[PDB]
């Protein structure tokens, strides 16, 4: 049986969306020329499909963020008073002094990630939601969680002190509420220390988002570099061929260049769709994780951080989202002799809620996740059956507190 | 003279022996906003990346938007322009461009001895 | 698009294959036929790849629908915001052309009132905690009630359990506990 506990804080990194890219078929393939455009026209439509695919990808990229973050009906604002039962929500809540409405951890996150081609017909669209709105959304979620609990998600937000909210979470995971109220200072100090450790470790990781950015950067660079290959033509510059050869000869040279560039563009588009599918799956997982761990408690194991889950707070990262799970893990232990049932007068006495333990001389009944021995009484136990059916049963007595009263 | 993309961008004059630069002319995509063809025939062209110094006028981070007025207020998004701007038709009617509104803001009276 | 792609020259002299067959000697028409072969093969490959990519997403959506059907319909789920907004009660399925439509019945509260609370009440120097509810006071008296509905009830020795003494509790107030056994004893 554990006799203590430690509060742990973890982090998880989940990419949400990527860059919205636009590519022009005609300017890339041919450019300023008109003979090349006329030749390309004979290929039916190998531009409309590419434009449609890229526009669909961009719309999906916007939808991922809209689904992940826009989960709150009203933008709550934290009250000025900071009497959160001893807890320190100052490295997470926004600081208006900074030019942006971000917080310390968010600022460390954006400073950690570091993010010509436009002349070739490759352009990058801007995100639909600028980072200020995302910061406002996350601040609203934090304020709702802190000042209301999980009630704000279900309906209208309901105020409640933070101490009783933490007591509700404790009672949810299987530890009676008196444990929190008796050990409030220790838990507050442990949580503050965990937040401090997270902040210190982050300053001095973010591999997922960096790799997501690097993949697109390398893909665009490869697409740009593919424009220099001859593909079997005499020269890789269309103007050079046009000014140096007759149209009847220049046509057959331009055909090979057109085929090569069209093939490269097809490859790039296919890779982009394959990557966007995976990003969509990750964004859906992130939305589910937010809606489950943040807006309420979770009974799923290992879903929201290792250990038993208490509460979580979201943070915003460039092209991603960060969760700070707060968990409850057991601590220093002790051996204990145990027994299934207690035999009193030919009647078994199963424990109503808890276990039967004994250090070697006296028997006690106590909860599973914390150690607080109590005397066996009629309120802790219920009788059922005889003393022969149970495989292992230990003789002892039961207090029955009614007898002293009648004296 | 070349660059990372390996395209001729700097040339030396064969006559005067001086250094020049090469830069392709400005270009970008064109996007149109329409409130539908059942209420009006009005539109509002949006140039993708051209600065408004080049070829009503409302310079945005997303690009130049002409044909639509700009207002102080903030309503729910109707047309996803980009960079936190959304246009709409309802203002005798004209297109307007504004900033997104996240939603109504409320503050809950949180005190250490109060419940709901 | 796949059908309309059949009407392009692809570099040959004509689009329909019959004209190529009739107008030219096959030893010269072989290259003209080869051009169309290449173009149409490329178009078919593009269409097939797009279809596979779309089928993956439809499969994922169908798996999600199956999970929601198995969890919301065949029982009650405690996963927040999964089986509809609000607390979840029960769901019914309906059919649709190439899809499924659910009807989530949800329980949502309204018309809230505010109150004053205390973490615990101590009567004779020992702190009492609520077993399953929360202590609320309307201004003169203290009652214990469940945390999702307002049904005040007089605080007794059956709504509370003692734990230690009322000095460690950061917030504590004075009150009385009914102790129903004593009045019946007399
Ligand atoms: C449970 O563990 C905590 C540590 O988190 C113990 O609290 C520390 O106790 C030592 C010894 O008295 C003090 O020096 C520390 O200041 C305490 N706090 C911390 C944060 O270390 C606590 O004593 C343990 N429980 C029991 C019953 O001993
Ligand atoms: C097992 O725990 C019980 C707790 O009740 C211990 O009982 C105590 O024993 C000492 C020594 O005889 C008495 O002075 C105390 O009054 C007893 N009660 C309490 C609450 O301390 C018992 O000693 C423990 N077993 C062993 C082997 O130490
Ligand atoms: C809080 O609720 C109690 C419920 O008992 C109210 O006390 C009752 O008030 C009415 C009207 O004055 C009396 O007729 C009853 O006899 C009272 N019950 C008692 C004293 O047990 C109390 O007034 C309420 N507080 C308010 C409304 O401020
Ligand atoms: C919270 O911690 C910061 C430093 O981490 C400190 O400056 C601030 O005073 C603390 N707040 C409270 C209420 O103790
Ligand atoms: C419990 O008993 C086992 C068996 O001897 C021992 O290995 C273990 O260390 C004991 N627990 C503690 C906390 O000492
Ligand atoms: C319990 O007591 C009964 C009667 O006193 C006896 O028959 C039985 O063997 C005892 N069991 C143990 C484990 O002492
Ligand atoms: C145009 O759209 C509006 C919007 O509902 C509709 O009321 C109207 O009947 C439509 N007109 C035609 C000709 O379809
Ligand atoms: C457009 O050009 C003007 C004039 O130089 C400049 O002040 C402005 O910043 C430019 N627009 C952008 C978005 O930089
Ligand atoms: C916003 O308000 C300011 C202050 O009067 C005004 O100068 C500006 O023109 C307004 N923006 C509009 C009308 O788009
Ligand atoms: C909270 O309750 C007090 C009385 O207990 C009342 O004066 C105040 O107006 C209430 N605040 C609300 C309902 O926001
Ligand atoms: C609640 O906060 C007030 C300050 O507004 C303070 O006087 C009071 O002691 C606090 N009570 C508890 C139980 O935290
Ligand atoms: C009422 O509560 C106060 C708070 O400490 C305490 O000092 C006082 O003794 C309590 N009343 C009685 C009758 O014990």
Numbering used by the authors:
A (entry chain B): 714 to 828, 852 to 940, 944 to 1146
B (entry chain A): 566 to 620, 641 to 676, 689 to 713
C (entry chain A): 961 to 1146
Study authors write:
The SARS-CoV-2 spike glycoprotein is the major surface antigen of the virus. Its function is to bind the host receptor ACE2 and mediate the subsequent membrane fusion required for cell entry. Here we have examined the structures and receptor-binding properties of spikes of the B.1.1.7 variant first described in Kent, United Kingdom (now termed Alpha)10,16–19 and the B.1.351 variant first described in South Africa (now termed Beta). Recently emerging variants of SARS-CoV-2 have acquired other substitutions in the spike including a number located at the monomer-monomer interfaces, at the receptor-binding site, and near the furin-cleavage site.
Inspection of the sequence of the Beta spike and comparison of its structure with that of the closed form of Wuhan spike and the open and closed forms of G614 spikes, suggests that the opening of Beta spike could be driven by the substitution K417N on the background of G614 (both also observed in the Omicron variant spike). In contrast, the substitution of an asparagine at position 417 in Beta removes an intramolecular salt bridge and would generate a steric clash with Tyr-369 of the neighbouring RBD leading to destabilisation of the closed form and thus promotion of the open form. In the same way that G614 is a prerequisite for realising tighter receptor binding by the substitution N501Y described above, it may also enable spike protein from the Beta virus to achieve an open conformation as a result of the K417N substitution.
